[PDB]
Write a protein that binds this ligand. Structure first.
Ligand code: GTP
Ligand code: MG
Length: 136
C-alpha cells in the first residue's frame, strides 16, 4: 500500500535506515527481516516462513486464518511490553502485512518485500488502518 523503495539488496535498507531507527519496525519475510537485523535495527515483530519470543503458526498459502490473526494480535501485545517477537509461519505469510497494519500502534513502520522489485515501507496511520480492515 505504501512506498516501494527500489534497488539491489541491500541498498533500500541503507536508504531508509535513519527512518527505521526512529520508529518501531515490523518486518514481513525472511529476506526483509534478515536485512533489517544486519543494519542494526531490531524489529518489534518479525514474521517469516519456516525453512526474542517465538510464536509458531500454520497458515496455508494465500489465506489469512483466524490463527494467524490471533498470533499477530498476541505479538503486538508482547511488543507493547517490550518483547521482540518472531512469528515463524508454516505455510505462507504472503498477506501478513495487512493484519500487521491493523493491530499496530500508529507511527509503526511495516516492511515487506516486493519480489525482485524492492522493499515496501508503510507508515501506519488511521487512513491505512481503515483500508486494511476493508481489505479484509
Ligand atoms: N530489489 C529488491 N528486492 C527486494 C529487496 N528486499 C526484498 N526484496 C524482494 O522481496 C522478496 C520477498 O522478500 P521476503 O518475503 O522477505 O522473502 P522470502 O524468501 O519470500 O521469505 P518468506 O516470506 O519468509 O518465505 C525477495 O525474494 C526479493 O526479491 C531489496 O532490497 N531489493
Ligand atoms: Mg515472503
Amino acid at each position: 500500500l505504501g512506498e516501494l523503495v527500489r534497488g539491489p539488496i541491500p541498498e533500500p535498507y541503507l536508504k531508509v535506515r535513519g527512518e527505521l531507527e526512529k520508529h518501531p519496525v515490523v518486518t514481513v519475510g525472511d529476506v526483509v527481516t534478515e536485512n533489517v537485523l544486519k543494519i542494526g535495527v531490531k524489529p518489534i515483530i518479525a514474521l517469516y516462513d519456516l525453512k526474542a519470543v517465538f510464536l509458531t503458526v500454520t497458515n496455508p498459502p494465500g489465506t489469512i486464518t483466524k490463527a494467524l490473526l490471533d498470533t499477530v494480535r498476541k505479538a503486538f501485545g508482547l511488543a507493547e511490553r517490550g518483547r521482540n517477537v518472531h512469528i515463524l509461519v508454516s505455510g505462507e505469510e504472503d498477506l501478513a502485512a495487512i493484519p500487521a497494519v491493523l493491530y499496530a500502534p500508529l507511527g509503526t513502520l511495516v516492511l515487506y518485500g516486493q519480489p525482485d522489485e524492492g522493499v515496501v515501507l508503510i507508515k501506519v496511520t488511521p487512513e491505512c488502518k481503515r483500508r486494511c480492515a476493508k481489505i479484509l
